[PDB]
Amino acid sequence: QKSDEVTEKFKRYCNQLEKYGQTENVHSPVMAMLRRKGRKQLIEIMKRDGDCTSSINKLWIVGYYHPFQFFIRDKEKNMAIAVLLTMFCGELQEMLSLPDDKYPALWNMYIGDFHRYMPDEEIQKCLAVGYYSRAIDLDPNQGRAFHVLAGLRADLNVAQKLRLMILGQLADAPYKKGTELLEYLKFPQKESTDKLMVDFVIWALNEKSKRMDYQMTGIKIVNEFKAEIEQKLEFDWSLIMSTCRLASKLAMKKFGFQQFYNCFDTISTLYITIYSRTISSKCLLAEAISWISDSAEILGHLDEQKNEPHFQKLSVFAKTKWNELNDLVMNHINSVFTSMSLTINPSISMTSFLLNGPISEPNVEFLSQLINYLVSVEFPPMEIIHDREESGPLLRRIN
Amino acid sequence: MSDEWEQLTVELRKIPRGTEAAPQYLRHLMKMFVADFETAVSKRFDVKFWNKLKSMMDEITKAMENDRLVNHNVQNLAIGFLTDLSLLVHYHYEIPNYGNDISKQLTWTPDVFLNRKPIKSKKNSRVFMAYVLLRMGDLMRYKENYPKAQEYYEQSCRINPADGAVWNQLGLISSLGAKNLESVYFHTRALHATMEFPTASGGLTNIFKNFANRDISRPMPIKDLYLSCLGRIHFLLEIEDSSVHLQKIGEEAATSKEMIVPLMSVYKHLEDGTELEQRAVEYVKTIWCTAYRSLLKTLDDYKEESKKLADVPHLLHILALLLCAPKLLRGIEDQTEDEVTSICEWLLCACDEKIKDSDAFGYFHCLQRIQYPLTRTQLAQKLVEIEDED
């Protein structure tokens, strides 16, 4: 019976906030009181089980966003907007500070919005970025955080920007439609490499339209890519390869296994080329392992028509290139892992690597995490030997 | 200092004072923090920050006839400013982890930052983090969320016990929860900390007054009896029955730092000579010696039942505290000699040389003269010294 009391109260408070929001000033004792009451009930709501979200959005919109919007449209205020925003932040900090809160990412993203709203050249604005990052560290399902991160940050490559937007579309709760990504793909780049990357992203995201033209264009992209890999003296491709991995993953999520399979082919070819050059940038391997992992995972899943895994519906030459790739990767992993040994229960956060990509050049624990995850897969291409004299940490399997 | 910091300094000093011009000052302090966190902490700009903020809160609280709505508003504003200060510091400098129990709203995680300047001297980061936690504790106390306030306070105390303010605030929290004994202990720690928070004295007095005039003859819980008797010691009053009461009190004080520590403080202050001071010091002597006896016996019995030494760290620390007043232990040397010899033998032959206090003595400077951390050998040497002087 208390549920009805609570629900009625929260609904009423929200309605009143929406109503009196238009007429009164942002410092109104009425509106602030209503906000306090609203949060007070919303806590007891969050205590329950259920998605909620709609309620939190309601209170955020009629209680915080709208009053701020009205506040901007006023020439009669003496207070700096940054100060009001700060007060709002301290007010919303109550939710995060309360233990057993179900939705920390949401609140972190709202406070992040508050810091984003601040005028430029205000120091407190920095934290905006941070806040969104925190949200993502709490829940990578919030794609809006990825999008806004792709917008705010200054110290990032085109690769990282595309990574962030794509991840914004990959998230289970993605950032609306995904028109913005395409819009950015419309903008030309000033370097060959990034031009290639964008080309591949467009091709990967492109629907089945122009079926044969799709194939031919793809071939052209592969050739241009190979040509660029050979021609360029040497620069870390792990950014572009990360971008392509995420993009192909998005292609899988968006359409089908075939659409993804074309990308799988292209990227496999690319990797085999880069490793054919024998050039060994420390950052690449971290991404290669990840790609092997994701690809294996997708290949393991049963087809939509059922009765067979997706791996079974693969040509002989495809499985050949697949095993060649895996052989190269395993060989490089073993090459790195002589006298480095295996870390057990690394428990390393993936947040940093997810947000920024592979620029760091990895440490042993980090690699150990990924390598563990690879053998964890339902169909492992590699598997650690129980006891090794010197080399052969991982050995091929299920090929 | 460099030219940039000096320019920022002039720009800082140019800013006017007052209730309304304060946010400008705060934000400029943030800018000076990000600019040079090291030098900022060097001149204790965290204190200046909290001073401007506390100023704002006070002036606004007063000017509005103590209205609740205004109070809440300025309070949440404060919370916002301080949180953003902590985060802005983290965003630019490699601040060491001080515990995953620390709220992540002030902390976040190392995974969300890019290129941070490395910390040069850790003392700055320790004092800063502890101070920020302390003031967030204050803010939580103002908002009447006592549990959170206590968490912030305990964390702050752990990071830097050398600031008596934290101990005092902990005392305030204890007093709010009607826990008077713990309040006395905390206020005492605040009084004799490494920073020495003198105001705590008043607090202590306030408690003493509320207990010194209780009918000791009448039945009451043990802790309350200790409070009334300590209070009667402080105000140079005659303890009604004395013998029985002091005996029981000492017997209980043998196992609690929250009685021993406040007793040291009152003893050191009283430590002089008057017609009444003599009587008071004698009361103290009775309690102290009783506690010494009981504790000695207990430790000896723990040696009997082959308890590992590490299984009694706090109990060894109360003993070392009891040894801080040799002049009080005169007269019972011969009686306690055997037990002392056995315990000393136990201490000499072992565990390794270190006794975890976790109560942070050594940041306690009331009548110390014991080099910390507590060495397994040093304690034995102290006991041997106490017995030897005879």
TrEMBL record, chain A:
GO terms for biological process: embryonic genitalia morphogenesis; nuclear-transcribed mRNA catabolic process, nonsense-mediated decay; regulatory ncRNA-mediated post-transcriptional gene silencing; siRNA processing. It comes from the Eukaryota. One of its GO terms (molecular function) is DEAD/H-box RNA helicase binding. GO terms for cellular component: cytoplasm; nucleus. Coiled coil: none annotated. This is Nonsense-mediated mRNA decay protein. It comes from Caenorhabditis elegans. The gene is smg-5.
TrEMBL record, chain B:
It comes from the Eukaryota. One of its GO terms (biological process) is nuclear-transcribed mRNA catabolic process, nonsense-mediated decay. GO terms for cellular component: cytoplasm; nucleus; telomerase holoenzyme complex. Keywords: Nonsense-mediated mRNA decay, TPR repeat. The keyword Mitochondrion does not apply. Residues 149-340 form the DNA/RNA-binding domain. The lineage of its organism: Eukaryota, Metazoa, Ecdysozoa, Nematoda, Chromadorea. This is DNA/RNA-binding domain-containing protein. Pfam families: EST1_DNA_bind. TPR repeats lie at residues 130-163. InterPro entries: DNA/RNA-bd_Est1-type, Est1/Ebs1-like, TPR-like_helical_dom_sf, TPR_rpt. PROSITE patterns: TPR (PS50005). GO terms for molecular function: telomerase RNA binding; telomeric DNA binding.
